[PDB]
Design a protein around this ligand. Structure first.
Ligand SMILES: COc1cccc(-c2cn(-c3ccc(CN4CCC(O)CC4)cc3)c3ncnc(N)c23)c1
Length: 256
């Protein structure tokens, strides 16, 4: 028995291909509604498993989470959502526009992600794979949460203990992506080195031109003890108010 998210497949025209991993397409829904469509390439994972993402997307509704529109829950299975016309944050950061972003833009992007994740937090959910590649960018630099040892808290990577606090860890790592225009965290380190070093207390240093106040925040996100890590509610307020309350004398530099 289907729910009120169900639509007939015939209402979808998959136009322009965007990515693969099944796939994701640009497309149209009913009359004149531009959407994104996730496909399941037969075999790779079970229907139930591909319909994890949709089922959670059904209960999560917020301005800074990518919005589910519809689902075709019989094969070939499709998930349908709003279309994010600037694609992934990671690609945006690394792209041609990426280099013009300065700290005011990057922090605002972080504030928006924190807000979506603050909502995930209030709803008692856990994301598990929070990072720039899973943030989508739209018009007016809107960032939405959608959808990785280097991004994963140690307790989670080692013991499968994923909580909102391990999401906070990942958010700290995401701040390094933002402040380096999308560089891979722990430059030159393989996953084993990162595990080994993090366990001995190593944390990434302050990125070049990143204000110390922003790095301290990263460090708080990376506290060994999950419960000592800030809430997203806290992160959202800090990042929202950053240039008044925290760094009121910020001046542009070469890159940030
Ligand atoms: C069911 O609908 C969903 C659910 C979850 C995510 C997406 C999604 C993914 N993308 C997407 C964005 C960027 C890329 C970029 N890509 C990977 C790295 C790079 O090499 C270039 C190609 C691929 C897919 C979207 N773009 C625009 N709009 C989207 N909704 C997406 C859609």
């Amino acid at each position: 028995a289907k729910d009120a998210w169900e639509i007939p497949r015939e209402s979808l025209r998959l136009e322009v291909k965007l990515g693969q991993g099944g796939e994701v397409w640009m497309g149209t829904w009913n009359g004149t509604t531009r959407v994104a469509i996730k496909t399941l390439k037969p075999g790779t994972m079970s229907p139930e498993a591909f319909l994890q993402e949709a089922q959670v997307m059904k209960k999560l509704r917020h301005e800074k989470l990518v919005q589910l529109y519809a689902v075709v829950s019989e094969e070939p299975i499709y998930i349908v959502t709003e279309y994010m016309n600037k694609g992934s944050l990671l690609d945006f950061l690394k792209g041609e526009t990426g280099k013009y972003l300065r700290l005011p833009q990057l922090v605002d992007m972080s504030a928006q992600i924190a807000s979506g994740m603050a909502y995930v937090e209030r709803m008692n959910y856990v994301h598990r794979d929070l990072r720039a590649a899973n943030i989508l960018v739209g018009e007016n630099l809107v960032c939405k949460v959608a959808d990785p040892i280097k991004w994963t808290a140690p307790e989670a990577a080692l013991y499968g203990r994923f909580t909102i606090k391990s999401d906070v860890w990942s958010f700290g790592i995401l701040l390094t992506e933002l402040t380096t225009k999308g560089r891979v965290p722990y430059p030159g380190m393989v996953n084993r080195e990162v595990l080994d070093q993090v366990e001995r207390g190593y944390r990434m240093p302050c990125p070049p031109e990143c204000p110390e106040s922003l790095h301290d925040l990263m460090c708080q996100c990376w506290r060994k003890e999950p419960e000592e890590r800030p809430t997203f509610e806290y992160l959202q307020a800090f990042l929202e108010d950053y240039f008044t309350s925290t760094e009121p004398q910020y001046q542009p530099g070469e890159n940030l």
